[PDB]
Amino acid sequence: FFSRDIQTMEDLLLHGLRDIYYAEQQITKALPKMIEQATNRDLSQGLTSHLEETQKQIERLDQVFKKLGQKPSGVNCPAIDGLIKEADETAGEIADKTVLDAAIVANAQAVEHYEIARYGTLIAWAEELGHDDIVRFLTTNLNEEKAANTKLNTVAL
Amino acid sequence: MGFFSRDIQTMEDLLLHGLRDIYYAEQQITKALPKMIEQATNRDLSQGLTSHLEETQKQIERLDQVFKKLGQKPSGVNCPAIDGLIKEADETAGEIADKTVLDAAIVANAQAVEHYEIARYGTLIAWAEELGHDDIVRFLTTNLNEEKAANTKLNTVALRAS
Ligand SMILES: [Fe+3]
Ligand SMILES: [Fe+3]
Ligand SMILES: [Fe+3]
Ligand SMILES: [Fe+3]
Ligand SMILES: [Fe+3]
Ligand code: NA
Ligand SMILES: [Zn+2]
Ligand SMILES: [Zn+2]
Ligand SMILES: [Zn+2]
Ligand SMILES: [Zn+2]
Ligand SMILES: [Zn+2]
Ligand SMILES: [Zn+2]
């Protein structure tokens, strides 16, 4: 019961974990739409594989919350909502299927970059706070985002 | 269906749309940075963000040259991604009770913004290269490198279980 309820670095870490939890849920909802829009088979397949990984990433975040002593929960993330809105609106503006695949690759890379920033931040805070225990899960998620980004950077349309 | 349904027809059109989107983001960043500077307590963070504000103004000047080369105005696309990043940064700052915690949040949100810009510049460079725009590739690469350097400086700012 405070208006400014983020009082400590531990509170900030918990808030960030709830923010990324919500973001992973939203990505699981957004990805099928992107996969349906994708023409290039490698792009469609790559996104489908990352959708499966994102489902696993949520399970790893459930493990993080369990290690911290609580049930999982999310908080709204305006950054992922804005990224998803931008991707959806831009897709509607594109007439050519190959141009659309280029936009899908770029928007997917922007999402991976947001995830890389967030996991990197959460890991650094966790380590500063003596929470090495949760870093193993966060690092597994982070490295899947890095891998997805790298693979997107190489997609040949 | 929105205003411009199916109006992006070519990779040149998509590059133009992406450049207008990052231009808008840079403009928004010039508006947001003074707020983050005022909120920041640590002088290396506050004075450091002031330097990134000066660099962002230079990046807009670089983009102005790119638009000149395309013969197109830089206005015309808003960026829901930067708008969401900046409003998340605002929201989170409003929830924080402690100056040291607020500085940690400022760094993290500034790093998230640098990562967005790094994603977009990387994409735009690749499209500009494919389209044969050598100077535009150089200008965008210069901008990209400033965002990478800013992110690294944020990763290194020396600020600060049962
Ligand atoms: Fe993820
Ligand atoms: Fe967020
Ligand atoms: Fe991802
Ligand atoms: Fe954008
Ligand atoms: Fe920047
Ligand atoms: Na039209
Ligand atoms: Zn648009
Ligand atoms: Zn910056
Ligand atoms: Zn910038
Ligand atoms: Zn919040
Ligand atoms: Zn909150
Ligand atoms: Zn703890």
Side-chain angles (χ1 to χ4, degrees), chain B residues 26 29 52 56 59 114 117 121 147:
Chain B
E26 297 291 9
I29 288 169
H52 200 58
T56 300
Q59 292 168 1
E114 297 312 301
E117 299 185 281
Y121 284 117
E147 311 297 6

PDB file of all heavy atoms in Angstrom, chain B residues 26 29 52 56 59 114 117 121 147, ligand 9:
ATOM      1  N   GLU B  26      13.947   9.657 -33.131  1.00  0.00           N
ATOM      2  CA  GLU B  26      14.998  10.584 -32.700  1.00  0.00           C
ATOM      3  C   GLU B  26      14.423  11.886 -32.177  1.00  0.00           C
ATOM      4  O   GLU B  26      14.850  12.380 -31.116  1.00  0.00           O
ATOM      5  CB  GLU B  26      15.980  10.872 -33.823  1.00  0.00           C
ATOM      6  CG  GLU B  26      16.780   9.662 -34.351  1.00  0.00           C
ATOM      7  CD  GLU B  26      17.836   9.048 -33.393  1.00  0.00           C
ATOM      8  OE1 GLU B  26      17.923   9.397 -32.195  1.00  0.00           O
ATOM      9  OE2 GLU B  26      18.567   8.131 -33.836  1.00  0.00           O
ATOM     10  N   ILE B  29      13.020  11.212 -28.767  1.00  0.00           N
ATOM     11  CA  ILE B  29      14.127  11.042 -27.842  1.00  0.00           C
ATOM     12  C   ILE B  29      14.646  12.427 -27.410  1.00  0.00           C
ATOM     13  O   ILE B  29      14.960  12.630 -26.233  1.00  0.00           O
ATOM     14  CB  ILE B  29      15.222  10.149 -28.462  1.00  0.00           C
ATOM     15  CG1 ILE B  29      14.715   8.678 -28.510  1.00  0.00           C
ATOM     16  CG2 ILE B  29      16.514  10.192 -27.580  1.00  0.00           C
ATOM     17  CD1 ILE B  29      15.598   7.761 -29.351  1.00  0.00           C
ATOM     18  N   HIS B  52      24.259  12.410 -24.637  1.00  0.00           N
ATOM     19  CA  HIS B  52      23.503  11.682 -25.652  1.00  0.00           C
ATOM     20  C   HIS B  52      22.420  12.538 -26.270  1.00  0.00           C
ATOM     21  O   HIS B  52      22.144  12.351 -27.463  1.00  0.00           O
ATOM     22  CB  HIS B  52      23.048  10.312 -25.223  1.00  0.00           C
ATOM     23  CG  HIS B  52      22.708   9.393 -26.371  1.00  0.00           C
ATOM     24  ND1 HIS B  52      23.595   9.058 -27.376  1.00  0.00           N
ATOM     25  CD2 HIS B  52      21.580   8.674 -26.626  1.00  0.00           C
ATOM     26  CE1 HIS B  52      23.001   8.230 -28.226  1.00  0.00           C
ATOM     27  NE2 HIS B  52      21.815   7.913 -27.742  1.00  0.00           N
ATOM     28  N   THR B  56      22.073  12.922 -30.197  1.00  0.00           N
ATOM     29  CA  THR B  56      20.787  12.704 -30.878  1.00  0.00           C
ATOM     30  C   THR B  56      20.468  13.873 -31.843  1.00  0.00           C
ATOM     31  O   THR B  56      19.959  13.657 -32.955  1.00  0.00           O
ATOM     32  CB  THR B  56      19.674  12.512 -29.829  1.00  0.00           C
ATOM     33  OG1 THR B  56      19.992  11.383 -29.017  1.00  0.00           O
ATOM     34  CG2 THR B  56      18.310  12.310 -30.524  1.00  0.00           C
ATOM     35  N   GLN B  59      22.429  13.188 -34.818  1.00  0.00           N
ATOM     36  CA  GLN B  59      21.835  12.116 -35.608  1.00  0.00           C
ATOM     37  C   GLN B  59      20.665  12.592 -36.457  1.00  0.00           C
ATOM     38  O   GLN B  59      20.468  12.107 -37.584  1.00  0.00           O
ATOM     39  CB  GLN B  59      21.335  11.053 -34.673  1.00  0.00           C
ATOM     40  CG  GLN B  59      22.507  10.371 -33.992  1.00  0.00           C
ATOM     41  CD  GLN B  59      22.058   9.511 -32.860  1.00  0.00           C
ATOM     42  OE1 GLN B  59      20.876   9.408 -32.585  1.00  0.00           O
ATOM     43  NE2 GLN B  59      23.015   8.909 -32.156  1.00  0.00           N
ATOM     44  N   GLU B 114      18.226   2.472 -26.629  1.00  0.00           N
ATOM     45  CA  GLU B 114      19.401   2.267 -27.510  1.00  0.00           C
ATOM     46  C   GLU B 114      19.235   0.973 -28.314  1.00  0.00           C
ATOM     47  O   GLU B 114      19.562   0.916 -29.505  1.00  0.00           O
ATOM     48  CB  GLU B 114      20.700   2.238 -26.697  1.00  0.00           C
ATOM     49  CG  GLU B 114      21.028   3.529 -25.979  1.00  0.00           C
ATOM     50  CD  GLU B 114      20.905   4.756 -26.861  1.00  0.00           C
ATOM     51  OE1 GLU B 114      21.596   4.831 -27.892  1.00  0.00           O
ATOM     52  OE2 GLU B 114      20.113   5.673 -26.540  1.00  0.00           O
ATOM     53  N   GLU B 117      16.899   1.507 -31.238  1.00  0.00           N
ATOM     54  CA  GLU B 117      17.585   2.259 -32.282  1.00  0.00           C
ATOM     55  C   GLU B 117      18.620   1.383 -32.985  1.00  0.00           C
ATOM     56  O   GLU B 117      18.732   1.452 -34.207  1.00  0.00           O
ATOM     57  CB  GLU B 117      18.261   3.464 -31.678  1.00  0.00           C
ATOM     58  CG  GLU B 117      17.286   4.397 -31.028  1.00  0.00           C
ATOM     59  CD  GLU B 117      18.041   5.592 -30.587  1.00  0.00           C
ATOM     60  OE1 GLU B 117      18.717   5.565 -29.529  1.00  0.00           O
ATOM     61  OE2 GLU B 117      17.982   6.611 -31.292  1.00  0.00           O
ATOM     62  N   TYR B 121      18.508   0.936 -36.945  1.00  0.00           N
ATOM     63  CA  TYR B 121      19.631   1.333 -37.813  1.00  0.00           C
ATOM     64  C   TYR B 121      20.240   0.142 -38.549  1.00  0.00           C
ATOM     65  O   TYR B 121      20.556   0.221 -39.736  1.00  0.00           O
ATOM     66  CB  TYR B 121      20.677   2.145 -37.086  1.00  0.00           C
ATOM     67  CG  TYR B 121      20.235   3.556 -36.850  1.00  0.00           C
ATOM     68  CD1 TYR B 121      20.065   4.057 -35.554  1.00  0.00           C
ATOM     69  CD2 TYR B 121      19.944   4.407 -37.925  1.00  0.00           C
ATOM     70  CE1 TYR B 121      19.662   5.408 -35.334  1.00  0.00           C
ATOM     71  CE2 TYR B 121      19.554   5.724 -37.712  1.00  0.00           C
ATOM     72  CZ  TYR B 121      19.430   6.224 -36.425  1.00  0.00           C
ATOM     73  OH  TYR B 121      19.027   7.517 -36.282  1.00  0.00           O
ATOM     74  N   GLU B 147      24.825   4.927 -31.259  1.00  0.00           N
ATOM     75  CA  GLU B 147      23.887   4.229 -30.353  1.00  0.00           C
ATOM     76  C   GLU B 147      24.592   3.091 -29.639  1.00  0.00           C
ATOM     77  O   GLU B 147      24.355   2.849 -28.445  1.00  0.00           O
ATOM     78  CB  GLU B 147      22.674   3.675 -31.131  1.00  0.00           C
ATOM     79  CG  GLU B 147      21.972   4.663 -32.076  1.00  0.00           C
ATOM     80  CD  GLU B 147      21.343   5.847 -31.404  1.00  0.00           C
ATOM     81  OE1 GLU B 147      21.495   6.057 -30.191  1.00  0.00           O
ATOM     82  OE2 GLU B 147      20.602   6.612 -32.057  1.00  0.00           O
TER      83      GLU B 147
HETATM   84 ZN    ZN C   9      19.279   8.059 -31.596  1.00  0.00          ZN
END
